[PDB]
Design a protein around this ligand. Structure first.
Ligand SMILES: O=c1ccc2c([nH]1)CCC[C@@H]2NCCCCCCCCCCNc1c2c(nc3ccccc13)CCCC2
Ligand SMILES: O=c1ccc2c([nH]1)CCC[C@@H]2NCCCCCCCCCCNc1c2c(nc3ccccc13)CCCC2
Ligand SMILES: *[C@@H]1O[C@H](CO)[C@@H](O)[C@H](O)[C@H]1NC(C)=O
Ligand SMILES: *[C@@H]1O[C@H](CO)[C@@H](O)[C@H](O)[C@H]1NC(C)=O
Ligand SMILES: *[C@@H]1O[C@H](CO)[C@@H](O)[C@H](O)[C@H]1NC(C)=O
Ligand SMILES: *[C@@H]1O[C@H](CO)[C@@H](O)[C@H](O)[C@H]1NC(C)=O
Ligand SMILES: *[C@@H]1O[C@H](CO)[C@@H](O)[C@H](O)[C@H]1NC(C)=O
Lengths: 528, 528
């Protein structure tokens, strides 16, 4: 039995699944920690106690408790990101697809979902690992981690809610993979972590954090990086937001112990109903409970670690999509709709910029406005919409990433940078939204290989080229087999487009805007 | 006798001069003030006292004492701007060209020379009025005014050295036209003042200043406006620079009366030798002794007079040249030369920005750099050369002028704006300098009409259309006889190119950059 595997914590029984005219083994819902319920809510995870008997790993697990998006109910485009199982605090499980026949000690890839640290699930259709596992002969793992207040409530100095527990969830699944993946045909010495949005930030946080470094080999970051402005907060802002969650729910605030005790008595969705209330500003692309810069998981500030080379030195493959900003504008900024072209007045432009840079003084806002307005044609709806689209994507994803890539490449052992700009032929979102945050994932996970999902043949070919770059990179530290994706170097700053056309190599991704965002604006905000 | 005219201060005898194979009358070297010599150095001008007999006005006067440029000795391109007569403090004279036969009561144009308030002459070949006078049938006057410390040494509170006496020279020459021009066939109700660079700034200071307003009808400003960053200083900075002039010359600094007395015993060129020493910073396009905002010639700050409409309401015609900055970079910035393409390293670009905006803090300098650098291609010597060129132009001439024209047009009675971008066929400066500060003047004064100067036919036609637009505007407030130069309006902000090609109307001259210079950079420098 291929399907019956003994792990360090007990036996597990998977299920044989179909993929593209063949089959593979899937092991769904394997527990890697004790359920973090009751008194364990907000605590570091504990390893799962060994169980007797056979764990039924034939079906997907619960998803962690999270804010459910109801903006477009029944709309496929938004529903595909929402949980597709029952939500429960009992949600620390992982999932594994193993090629049939079982390999000997093959390359392992562990997927870390995004969703702004406030949402996500391991079980979504677009994260189905069976296509990538099959086509590339890797052992594919998806983990899960607490999100929202559950994962990231931070009262620094309490051991009861220390912060960063969702990251430590991640770290325990990786520890689990290190310990057990050899029984499924993986090499624990050849594991790649990869993920998107807060998942890509997560990946980079494990590159940084000393307790996480030795649990993987190399890394892929899609549309996220550790240093994103939404991806972390100071101990003092986490403490303020935690206390404010308390005040929103009429908690006793006299000490950490009484606050924590009161928050532990509330049902999950009571916390989620006030979660957004703790944000200190009106905004877009900001999340309430995120990683905290604590001196433990992160021993010093991210920038100082990045300048000093205090981070895992290995190979990384990362990149961005063309219009990262668009869905955040749709969901939170005035003048945008999924049923129109979303031409934006000048008034709505200016309000969108305040939302996008909520921490900027007036001089700050003026700077952004200035950098992104065509003053010959400032009442042009299309230019205002697209200029605000670039603000949001440059500020939140692209420029944070180009900073990370430049800092990392100084010490690293090799960097491959992409720019994903294919708009899929079957997209249900409107044209104006372009190449959307998250929409490279379907290609990574091989979904265009499924004829019933109505992708073009050229899209199947692109997904295959992407899968092979990613799996090759995972296996060898180099996405190219022995036409060529070059190494990004400090000197030449090369990157490739990723679309259906023949591969073009460019240099200096978004340098002009990235200088503004990485060098001038911070300098101005620090001076004023 | 057409040549013998009796004026309010005595009789004058002019001379018949050949022009384009006809003739006209010239009255050269007419005194309009007492010689501002000895104990009148630094004081307000006084009116010329009447003379007996007949003043011989057959030859040009002396030029005012000034720093003579010796950077390119005998090179025609720089010597055309230097004094071509003896320098003397006894320099307050004016020149008049009258059509023959004498007209009855025709349009007058009075020219005010530039040269940064530290130089210039009424007598240059390029300012010879006979072509414009003859072709357009106008009475053409050129005045003179003290420059440098002789005209702008300001010790506010003293009546011996109040500041702005060069402006009052100009104004006395205007009062003399108002009183005497009817005798030469001009109408004093129909006078236009025009000037270039500091001349143009001059013209606009007369529009602003209550004491000058009633001595002209309308105005033409060429590459200068009153609010230029070099065109004025506070009474504090004026005082500081006058004291420093004293210190550079070992003067008793114990009182105004003692400092002034010492500066009056110095020979003129000893002031001139240390003139540049008093500037606060290393700079380009900055000049030591300039108009002061005194509370008398200018009752309040230029900006509040402009905002409140406290100025003469009339018709204006004004404009700028394509490459105003270029000769300033040649004379004073690193990597520039008249004999090469002046491809500028990034280091010489940076050191050029600091000279170009000598007041800026580091944040300021950063902003400028960022606005004018292509970060894809930052070591491109040509893009750096041209970027710095535009900096110098935009900051010192174009954006000050575009501020002025927008504030003026809210109250004025008609504005016409031009962008002169014709590089002359027979230019002696290199191509990199483009369309140079001062090089429209030859068109305006009709020099291309002289075959021996070896302009093309099309440059001849251009000079004729230009003279005709200026003289038609002088005559009627509208450059067009009713292809049409449209009015500049607050809404549509139209202007035309002036070159050898058919008219193009465009909108919003240099708005993208003028937004940075007039709105953002000043907020940035105000916070920090
Ligand atoms: O960004 C916002 C928007 C609105 C608001 C705020 N912030 C805070 C202040 C209050 C305001 N409204 C409060 C409720 C917030 C609504 C929550 C946003 C829902 C986002 C849905 C996440 N889904 C994903 C989508 C896409 N890509 C994703 C990729 C990463 C995983 C999640 C994704 C592409 C298109 C549509 C959806
Ligand atoms: O602008 C500068 C340049 C250099 C320097 C400073 N400032 C201050 C710091 C010290 C430095 N060097 C000190 C010597 C100063 C020399 C002054 C420059 C001479 C310019 C001569 C005026 N000539 C004119 C020219 C032109 N146009 C003019 C139109 C306006 C009237 C004068 C003009 C076009 C081309 C060449 C010349
Ligand atoms: C395992 O669990 C699921 C769902 O709760 C069930 O439907 C399935 O048939 C079970 N199978 C075995 C072999 O235990
Ligand atoms: C990775 O490190 C090894 C030696 O430690 C070296 O040979 C190789 O060149 C490095 N590669 C890159 C791209 O840094
Ligand atoms: C794609 O195409 C087919 C046939 O043209 C259709 O029946 C099916 O509904 C479409 N697939 C999806 C899931 O959109
Ligand atoms: C006036 O001066 C000029 C030139 O120096 C000359 O040709 C003419 O003789 C003079 N006229 C009289 C009356 O002196
Ligand atoms: C100039 O003023 C007159 C009346 O004083 C007016 O009717 C005319 O339109 C004005 N023109 C402009 C361009 O303001």
């Amino acid at each position: 039995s291929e399907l019956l595997v003994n792990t360090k914590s007990g036996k597990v029984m998977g299920t044989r699944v179909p993929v593209l005219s063949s089959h593979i083994s899937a092991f769904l819902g394997i527990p890697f920690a004790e359920p973090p319920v009751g008194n364990m809510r907000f605590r570091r995870p504990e390893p799962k106690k060994p169980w007797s008997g056979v764990w039924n790993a034939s079906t997907y697990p619960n998803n962690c408790q999270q804010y459910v998006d109801e903006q477009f109910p029944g709309f496929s485009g938004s529903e595909m990101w929402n949980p597709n199982r029952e939500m429960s605090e009992d949600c620390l499980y992982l999932n594994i697809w193993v090629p049939s026949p079982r390999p000997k000690s093959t390359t392992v890839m562990v997927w870390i979902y995004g969703g702004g640290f406030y949402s996500g699930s391991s079980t979504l259709d677009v994260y189905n690992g069976k296509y990538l596992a099959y086509t590339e002969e890797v052992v594919l793992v998806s983990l899960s981690y607490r999100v929202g207040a559950f994962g990231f409530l931070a009262l620094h100095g309490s051991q009861e809610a220390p912060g960063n527990v969702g990251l430590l969830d991640q770290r325990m699944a990786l520890q689990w993979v290190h310990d057990n993946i050899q029984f499924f045909g993986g090499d624990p010495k050849t594991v790649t972590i990869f993920g998107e949005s807060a998942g890509g930030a997560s990946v980079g946080m494990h590159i940084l954090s000393p307790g996480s470094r030795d649990l993987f080999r190399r890394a892929i970051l899609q549309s996220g990086s550790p240093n994103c402005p939404w991806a972390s907060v100071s101990v003092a802002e986490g403490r303020r937001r935690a206390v404010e969650l308390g005040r929103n729910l009429n908690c006793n605030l006299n000490s950490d112990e009484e606050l924590i005790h009161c928050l532990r008595e509330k049902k999950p969705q009571e916390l989620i109903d006030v979660e957004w209330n703790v944000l200190p500003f009106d905004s877009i692309f900001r999340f309430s409970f995120v990683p905290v810069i604590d001196g433990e998981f992160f021993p010093t500030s991210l920038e100082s670690m990045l300048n000093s080379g205090n981070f895992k030195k290995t190979q990384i493959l990362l990149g961005v999509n063309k219009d990262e900003g668009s869905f955040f504008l749709l969901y939170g900024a005035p003048g945008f709709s999924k049923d129109s072209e979303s031409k934006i007045s000048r008034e709505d432009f200016m309000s969108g910029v305040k939302l996008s840079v909520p921490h900027a003084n007036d001089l700050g806002l003026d700077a952004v406005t200035l950098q992104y307005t065509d003053w010959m044609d400032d009442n042009n709806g299309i230019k205002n919409r697209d200029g605000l689209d670039d603000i949001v994507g440059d500020h939140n994803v692209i420029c944070p990433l180009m900073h990370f890539v430049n800092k990392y490449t100084k010490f690293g052992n090799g960097t491959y940078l992409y720019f994903f700009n294919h708009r899929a032929s079957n997209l249900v979102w409107p044209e104006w939204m372009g190449v959307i945050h998250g929409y490279e994932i379907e290609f990574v996970f091989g979904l265009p290989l499924v004829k019933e999902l109505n992708y073009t043949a050229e899209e199947e070919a692109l997904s295959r080229r992407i899968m092979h770059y990613w799996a090759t990179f995972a296996k060898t530290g180099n996405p190219n087999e022995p036409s060529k994706w070059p190494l990004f170097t400090t000197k030449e700053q090369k990157f490739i487009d990723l679309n259906t056309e023949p591969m073009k190599v460019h240099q200096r991704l978004r340098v002009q805007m990235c200088v503004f965002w990485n060098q001038f604006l911070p300098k101005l905000l620090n001076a004023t």
